[PDB]
Design a protein around this ligand. Structure first.
Ligand code: MG
Ligand code: MG
Ligand code: MG
Ligand code: MG
Ligand code: MG
Ligand code: MG
Ligand code: MG
Ligand code: MG
Ligand code: MG
Ligand code: MG
Ligand code: MG
Ligand code: MG
Ligand code: MG
Ligand code: MG
Ligand code: MG
Ligand code: MG
Ligand code: MG
Ligand code: MG
Ligand code: MG
Ligand code: MG
Ligand code: MG
Ligand code: MG
Ligand code: MG
Ligand code: MG
Ligand code: MG
Ligand code: MG
Ligand code: MG
Ligand code: MG
Ligand code: MG
Ligand code: MG
Ligand code: MG
Ligand code: MG
Ligand code: ZN
Lengths: 134, 86, 52, 158, 122, 50, 135
RNA sequence: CGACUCUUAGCGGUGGAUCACUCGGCUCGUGCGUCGAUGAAGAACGCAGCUAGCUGCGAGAAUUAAUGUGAAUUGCAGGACACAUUGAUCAUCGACACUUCGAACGCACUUGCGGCCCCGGGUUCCUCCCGGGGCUACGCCUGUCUGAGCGUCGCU
RNA sequence: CGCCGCAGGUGCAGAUCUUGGUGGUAGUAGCAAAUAUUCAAACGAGAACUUUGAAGGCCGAAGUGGAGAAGGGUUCCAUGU
RNA sequence: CAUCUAAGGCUAAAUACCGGCACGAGACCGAUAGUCAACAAGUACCGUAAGGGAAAGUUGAAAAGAACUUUGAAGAGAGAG
RNA sequence: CGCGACCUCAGAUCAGACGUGGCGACCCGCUGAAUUUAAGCAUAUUAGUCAGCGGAGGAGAAGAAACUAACCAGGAUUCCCUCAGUAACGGCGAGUGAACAGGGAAGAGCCCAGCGCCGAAUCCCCGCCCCGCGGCGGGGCGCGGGACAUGUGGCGUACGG
């Protein structure tokens, strides 16, 4: 369990930090698992969700193998919007349904120089831990 | 008559706004604030009213300078320095 | 806050309670009455080698 | 009002005692803080005794305690004089010195100078410059034989 | 089409002031369009131009201040804003030199009787 | 009165400007919790401090 | 001495406090002189003072002041102590020789009132109820 | 027969108890232990495209720069942003900036009025007008300059 | 939540108790100081009360008139509901 | 006889800490409780002033916050969703 | 009957500095009640407390004996345990009330004036050059100013020198 005297385990303090988190650490909170194929190709498990990467919904009403491109990362409401994950409201217009990124699986990563830099950063640390415990 | 009739005659203000502390306690005829005692150099403050003290103590306002002091203390009040350019 | 939260117990009585607790932890009836599922345990003063 | 047999009690609680109450909830934290400071000090003075300077043998004053011997504030100037130790060099080599204490008798005076001679013989003096040992101590006596003494230096026993 | 601080820094005072003037006439035009209806595009450019004016003025004031620091470097007396602003109490403290200088009596005591490093055997 | 100082007139100006309803788009903000301006002041109901 | 400053000598209370005249200030006149010099010269540190003369109605003292920010004081040890912030307005806290004489400080049986540093230091220690964790 | 009244139950109202929840307190402990004439605390007035409060900020005004981060902010709109001839946002914050009162400092204030020195314009240097900038508080230390005294003296 | 222990800010009908809510009273008292209204029309879903017109009255220049000081602070003025 | 050497000065540590900055915890309270303040709270409001000083938490997983038809001038309904 | 030296004073928007005000839980200096208890009440108590005023710091104050003791003597200050609800005070009523020794936390010592000696050996300021800017120092120079014999610095302080 936790032994750090400067890290809190208080429920009120943790919920306060979660719901009042600045958007640059809301990015890390809103991470998603990678698929088994991506988790093999890159030696990483999780990844912060991004505006242009493709996910599957694995929990809830919109479960399935349909690959949807993320269209909006609404960090204020801790949800993401995906292409076909939507419903008609009363007047007949479509509205996106917000889904927590922890309930999706990233299948294709929107790649740029920063994403590859983070991906190799996470992989190198994992390899260091593997060879430390080897 | 001391009741309703006498209330009609009051139309001259005893107090006005105070250029220090901004309260409507500046006695015009005495030229003294009844809350801060403005023409006196020292702020009017009494320990028999702890409730009045916490209404106007440090922290109830903006702390434009003290907020920066509390931040700068954490790095030893460093000056004349810049983060290393990228 | 000055409610006397703490109690002091005699060292001889605290030593006594340890002796009673150790002695009771050597009897299968008392340990099972705590509910410790010692049914296939080979011996109840269960001692293992130092390699542990 | 008194009731039957009892003791005439006079509590001293007529003086607004509740505004001055010292609780001791910081006692375990104070013991930790003192212990940490003791450990930090011992690390600071690396081979020197962790307790501090050596204190003299002292007889307790009154007729209740004159059969008892404890540790005093510092060695008197007459004791250092006949032990051959300068009163300003003594403090630098870990000997406490009390310039205001006199010696009324020769038994206590001679017992403290035997104490100083024994300490001076037990003392390992590191050279001021480790490369050049001038008059301090042989390198064999300080290579590994120098450890931090714990507890009072030569504790006073009855 | 924007302005950045980094590429403003090589410019000279005249062309920095000219760029400040052009942003100021555009901001006044935007405030005109605000009170005459205008468009959402013109209304949203108000903040962009306002930040641009702040950007130019920050670079102007930084360049001027850094030149004045260089000019007064090594001089005995400096303007108060160029002096360090640590804390009123920290500015009243003894400086590093006089905090550490000793009397001759103290110097002899340290020279004659330095604290020795010693150990005591059990 | 008609005769007023500049400080009094400026104080009355700020009191006038903040005596307006909340914008309607405030009510659509995330985690709003604000229904209406509770600091509305009517000239006849509540008199100003000065 | 110190006349009690009450209107018309009325000290509304029990007879033991009816005194108006024959009352005495707890600090000496020399200490009052140092306080008046220090308050006027708030930028200087009072060091000591001495007696230079008196008549029926006046006492005269001469107070030694030090400018803490003069270089002849800053650059000299053995007088750098007066420049430390803990030594500003010594005369107003009874830290001068005249001011300290009225505090009852001393060593031995005659000065048990001030063990702990002051009378209030002694009073607090003697009037605080020590409630340990284990009673 | 109805009405009315009473009792009980079903349902519906009125009301907001109970229970469950908790980004709040209270208590204890720890480590630091830092304001101000280089203008504090406090107050006033302003500042957002749509903004009243709260919050943030000071005419560079819901923020500039720098650094870290690395694609958002979001209620709506608008518009950027090759993320490499560098970057949204957030955080940090060491550069810069920081209106008016206020110890508050030219004098004074429930108003207002000076003086001195430079710069620019009408002048087209001479001092009038307009604008801009810098000064102009009290106490006090060291030194400086200018002085006063039928104070003590010296030379004439 | 039960059982074995432990610890309480541990049990309400009252305190002209505290806070909140709700009855009967009760569709009751009342909406009675300063003479007074009426006809037609318009707008409007709707008119004793609004507007216009026509009458009959009142203030009667120490006014129920026209303007100010203090105080108020936008109540001023249009448009709409 | 003993004991010190006044009327000048400095000095860390152990000690204190219901204000401040930043943390951790609890056999505490759980929206009439706990801070007055869980919320635009020293706010609204009251007093000439010194000063006094509240009430006020909860849709839902997601606004998916009831399109459309119908009566009514609307509030408000009946269907539908 | 002018010019100087000094002394004692004055002015300046003179050159360079410093103080003011806030917070105030803890700390230092003063001032300082009454409710209350005494089953009344005046001394006493509350209490050197509340309120009032002033001054600080990260701690403050205190502090190296004009001490304790009476011993086979201890040895600055501060804090804890104990002494001790004791010695003592008190309408000897109600009530109040320490210290020494002992055990611990910590532990650290010193500096002037004076008496003397040393060609004032001393210090501040302003210029110039150099090394550096960081809490502005060093080094050198100035028949450059001032302070200072109405006493600066070195030695030295009761433990003697
Ligand atoms: Mg009356
Ligand atoms: Mg009047
Ligand atoms: Mg000397
Ligand atoms: Mg009215
Ligand atoms: Mg009495
Ligand atoms: Mg019901
Ligand atoms: Mg930036
Ligand atoms: Mg006037
Ligand atoms: Mg003369
Ligand atoms: Mg109860
Ligand atoms: Mg009840
Ligand atoms: Mg009726
Ligand atoms: Mg009627
Ligand atoms: Mg008539
Ligand atoms: Mg009229
Ligand atoms: Mg109107
Ligand atoms: Mg509450
Ligand atoms: Mg409830
Ligand atoms: Mg209606
Ligand atoms: Mg000047
Ligand atoms: Mg009585
Ligand atoms: Mg009674
Ligand atoms: Mg009575
Ligand atoms: Mg007080
Ligand atoms: Mg102060
Ligand atoms: Mg001190
Ligand atoms: Mg002292
Ligand atoms: Mg001595
Ligand atoms: Mg006993
Ligand atoms: Mg007493
Ligand atoms: Mg110890
Ligand atoms: Mg001398
Ligand atoms: Zn005021």
């Amino acid at each position: 369990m936790k032994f750090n005297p400067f890290v809190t385990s208080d429920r009120s303090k943790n919920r306060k930090r979660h719901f009042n988190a600045p958007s640059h650490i809301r990015r890390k909170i809103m991470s998603s698992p990678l698929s088994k194929e991506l988790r093999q190709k890159y030696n990483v498990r999780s990844m912060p969700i991004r505006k242009d990467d493709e996910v599957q919904v694995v929990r809830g009403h919109y479960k399935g193998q349909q690959i949807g491109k993320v269209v909006q990362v609404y960090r204020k409401k801790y949800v993401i919007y995906i292409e076909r994950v939507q419903r008609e409201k009363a007047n007949g217009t479509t509205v996106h349904v917000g889904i927590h990124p922890s309930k999706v699986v990233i299948t294709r990563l929107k790649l740029d120089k920063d994403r590859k830099k983070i991906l190799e950063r996470k992989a190198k640390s994992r390899q260091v831990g593997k060879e430390k415990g080897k | 008559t001391k009741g309703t009739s006498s209330f009609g005659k009051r139309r001259n203000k005893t107090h006005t706004l105070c250029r220090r502390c901004g309260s409507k306690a500046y006695h015009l005829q005495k030229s003294t604030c009844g809350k801060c005692g403005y023409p006196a150099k020292r702020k009017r403050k009494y320990n028999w009213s702890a409730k009045a003290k916490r209404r106007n103590t440090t922290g109830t306002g903006r702390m434009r300078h003290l907020k920066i002091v509390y931040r700068r203390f954490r790095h030893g009040f460093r000056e004349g320095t810049t983060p290393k350019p990228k | 806050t000055w409610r006397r939260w703490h109690r002091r117990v005699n060292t001889t009585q605290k030593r006594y309670a340890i002796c009673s607790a150790l002695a009771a932890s050597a009897l299968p009836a008392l340990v099972m009455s705590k509910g410790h599922r010692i049914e296939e345990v080979p011996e109840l003063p269960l001692v293992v080698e130092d390699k542990v | 009002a008194p009731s039957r047999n009892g003791m005439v009690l006079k509590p001293h609680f007529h003086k607004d005692w509740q505004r001055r109450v010292a609780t001791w909830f910081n006692q375990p934290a104070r013991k930790i803080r003192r212990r940490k400071a003791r450990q930090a000090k011992a690390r600071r003075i690396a081979p020197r005794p962790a307790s501090g300077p050596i204190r003299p043998i002292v007889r307790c004053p009154t007729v209740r305690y004159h059969t008892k011997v404890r540790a005093g504030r510092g060695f008197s100037l007459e004791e250092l004089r006949v032990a051959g130790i300068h009163k300003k060099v003594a403090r630098t080599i870990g000997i406490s010195v009390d310039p205001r204490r006199r010696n009324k008798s020769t038994e206590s005076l001679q017992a403290n100078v035997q104490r100083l001679k024994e300490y001076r013989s037990k003392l390992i003096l590191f050279p001021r410059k480790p490369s050049a040992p001038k008059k301090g101590d042989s390198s064999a006596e300080e290579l590994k034989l120098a450890t931090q003494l714990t507890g009072p230096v030569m504790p006073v026993r009855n | 089409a924007k302005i950045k601080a980094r590429d403003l820094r090589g410019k000279k005072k005249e062309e920095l002031l000219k760029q400040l003037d052009d942003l100021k006439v555009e901001l006044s035009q935007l405030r005109v369009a605000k009170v005459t209806g205008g468009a959402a595009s013109k209304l949203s450019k108000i903040r962009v131009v306002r930040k641009s004016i702040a950007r130019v003025l920050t670079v102007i004031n930084q360049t001027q201040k850094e030149n004045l620091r260089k000019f007064y470097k090594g001089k005995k007396y400096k303007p108060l804003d160029l002096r360090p602003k640590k804390t009123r109490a920290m500015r009243r403290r003894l400086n590093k030199h006089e905090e550490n200088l000793k009397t001759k009596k103290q110097q002899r005591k340290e020279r004659l009787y330095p604290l020795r490093k010693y150990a005591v055997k059990a | 009165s008609s005769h007023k100082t500049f400080r009094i007139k400026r104080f009355l100006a700020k009191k006038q400007k903040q005596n307006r309803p909340i914008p309607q788009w405030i009510r659509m903000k995330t985690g709003n919790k604000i229904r209406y301006n509770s600091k509305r002041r009517h000239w006849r109901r509540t008199k100003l401090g000065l | 001495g110190r006349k009690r400053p009450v209107p018309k000598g009325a000290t509304y209370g029990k007879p033991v406090h009816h005194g108006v005249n024959q009352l005495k200030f707890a600090r000496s006149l020399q200490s009052v002189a140092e306080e008046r010099a220090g308050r006027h010269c708030g930028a200087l540190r009072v060091l000591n003072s001495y007696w230079v003369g008196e008549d029926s109605t006046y006492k005269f003292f001469e107070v030694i002041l030090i400018d803490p920010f003069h270089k002849a004081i800053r650059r000299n040890p053995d007088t750098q102590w007066i420049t430390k912030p803990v030594h500003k307005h010594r005369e107003m806290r009874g830290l001068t020789s005249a001011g300290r004489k009225s505090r009852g400080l001393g060593k031995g049986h005659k000065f048990h009132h001030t063990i702990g540093g002051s009378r209030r230091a002694a009073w607090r220690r003697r009037n605080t109820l020590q409630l340990h964790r284990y009673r």
